[PDB]
């Protein structure tokens with residue numbers, strides 16, 4: 016359950032990220048691939064090397080999904096429904112992996128947001144990404 | 157997301173359990189204490205030995221909470237709200253521990269439900285206990 | 298992992314009654330049904346569309362038999378699980394890249410299968426002994442990640 | 444866990460710039476704020492009611508300093524983390540019964556603290572090297588559960 020303060024904090028952080036969101040999404044993915052190599056197996060058709068257009072493209076989409084969630088934070092199950100279907104039914108993404116990308120998203124924000132990444136905002140962002148992850152893993156059948 | 161078939165399966169299993177629910181709750185707790193000894197630290201004021209009136213009493217309450225969830229399966233966040241407050245705010249129960257008790261509840265049902273514990277019903281029960289666990293861990297702040 | 302003599306007794310006594318041609322298939326099938334993301338690793342097995350298709354799938358049964366064979370091998374070497382599972386660790390970790398959380402899940406599924414099969418005989422202390430075993434096998438299978 | 448020479452270089456180079464009087468306190472505090480169930484183990488620390496109270500709590504800072512001292516000790520013995528963490532494993536597992544998942548969380552919090560402190564210098568390969576380290580420390584600290 017995201018509190019009013021959590022929603023404030025998350026909106027504030029993503030505001031600062033501003034138009035770098037796409038680039039940061041790509042960076043978080045790269046961090047995940049390097050830190051947690053088991054995650055790479057979902058992307059056999061990707062070149063995952065640094066500067067990859069495919070990782071960049073996906074990073075933009077990931078950022079777009081997260082922004083959609085922020086923008087509709089009280090309706091996240093609905094907002095992310097199609098994405099939850101994709102990740103569970105078609106992609107068969109192990110639920111563990113959401114915690115890995117979530118961590119890498121936090122790290123990326125921390126590396127780019129010196130002023131904003133306070134302990135409180137850190138906590139709010141973690142709750143937000145946990146909420147997103149919960150929706151994205153809600154559709155296994 | 158519990159499907160219509162999941163709800164059917166869960167209602168069917170708990171119907172068979174019938175009035176043994178309280179006893180089974182106590183058994184699941186005992187299984188947890190023996191299998192996962194880290195869980196015992198939440199109960200320093202309990203005698204956790206076999207036949208303990210305190211474990212029996214708590215088992216009845218646990219069963220009652222689960223039955224309440226089954227009975228209001230489309231409104232579980234509301235139904236279990238007070239319990240989610242208790243386990244997060246007051247008890248500070250590590251979220252990992254919900255998976256442990258959930259497993260022990262499944263084992264207990266499996267040990268008592270030869271006909272009912274089919275792979276499909278097993279899957280439905282796992283989803284149900286995961287849903288309960290999700291609500292019970294939604295209130296950390 | 299350290300099993301007491303009473304825990305070793307509990308485990309070996311029950312295991313002697315296990316149908317080793319079926320129980321592995323039953324555990325692997327339930328893994329695929331209950332935790333459907335695991336089906337990702339078994340695309341070549343064919344029809345996994347329904348629980349009945351999974352459980353009745355001959356390749357699921359055949360593969361489960363191999364899995365159970367490895368559990369049996371661990372039960373015979375409880376004090377050297379690492380060595381016993383070394384080559385399987387390389388396969389599951391280095392080659393397949395299965396997240397080790399799934400090793401814990403399969404172990405817990407096996408525990409549910411044993412509970413279903415043995416009923417009241419699968420007592421809380423017997424389960425506790427088995428949890429030590431499956432945790433040990435999972436940790437050994439995951440050694441290449443460590 | 445096996446760090447390459449390049450990974451060892453990345454880790455030791457960054458660590459030399461860490462303020463060891465602060466970073467541990469920062470990581471422990473954020474653990475208590477972000478994963479509030481962990482406060483269960485620190486009841487004697489007093490005021491943990493708000494993020495500011497946690498972060499400014501002198502006992503949090505003092506204890507964090509000890510935690511970081513142990514990470515430093517692991518960094519100096521990357522090829523013998525088990526032995527390095529043996530007595531701490533007995534404490535956290537046998538005496539405190541902390542679930543080992545929380546060892547992973549604290550490690551990941553430390554990684555976030557390093558990222559915040561070093562910014563662009565905390566590159567993706569540098570992080571990957573640090574993830575190997577904190578995974579290793581968590582696994583060693585959890586040895587008594589294995």
Ligand code: HEM
Nearest residue numbers: 054057058076077080081098102106108112113116147151
């Ligand atoms: C915050 C968590 C996540 C978000 C917001 C997210 C979002 C997205 C989005 C928006 C797409 C593009 C969908 C489309 O093109 O129609 C996508 C694709 C994909 N995602 Fe995720 N995802 C997340 C976590 C993960 C994780 C943890 C994994 C696996 C480790 C994963 C694996 C994939 C794969 C394999 C694709 C397909 C890429 C392709 O073939 O083009 N996702 N995701």
Ligand code: HEM
Nearest residue numbers: 195198199217218221222239243247249253254257288292
């Ligand atoms: C399916 C999951 C769970 C359910 C449905 C559940 C339900 C309950 C209920 C109904 C109570 C009684 C509340 C009252 O008396 O007002 C309770 C108390 C308690 N629960 Fe849980 N619980 C669950 C999981 C857990 C877990 C995993 C732990 C820790 C390992 C835990 C620890 C406790 C503790 C320490 C108490 C207080 C006992 C006392 O002091 O009397 N619960 N729970």
Ligand code: HEM
Nearest residue numbers: 335338339363364367368393395399400403404434435438
């Ligand atoms: C305790 C846990 C497990 C044990 C003891 C185990 C054991 C085994 C055994 C004995 C084999 C046969 C290897 C051979 O042909 O020599 C095997 C193969 C295989 N396992 Fe597992 N396994 C476990 C968990 C898992 C899980 C959780 C997955 C995926 C979710 C998985 C995926 C596979 C795959 C895809 C193969 C075939 C590899 C190949 O033939 O190339 N395993 N495993």
Ligand code: HEM
Nearest residue numbers: 481484485509510513514539541545546549550580581584
């Ligand atoms: C990598 C993870 C961790 C490391 C390296 C670490 C390290 C340490 C160190 C160096 C001490 C001081 C021991 C002494 O006085 O000799 C300590 C004590 C303590 N730790 Fe941790 N710790 C970790 C994780 C945790 C976690 C996650 C918790 C709880 C959530 C925890 C709870 C405690 C408590 C309660 C004490 C005080 C014990 C006492 O004085 O009796 N630790 N730890």
